[PDB]
Design a protein around this ligand. Sequence first.
Ligand SMILES: [Zn+2]
Length: 46
Amino acid sequence: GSSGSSGTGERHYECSECGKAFARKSTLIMHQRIHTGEKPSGPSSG
Ligand SMILES: [Zn+2]
């Protein structure tokens, strides 16, 4: 039925942005953030 390991379930989600493989799906999302942001600015301040 809907139960029974019958082996392993390696589910590594890679980042379509860089290509980094993670263990959890959500985790990857949090990472992708690094990409979207840090917009390019001329006058470096901070
Ligand atoms: Zn990435």
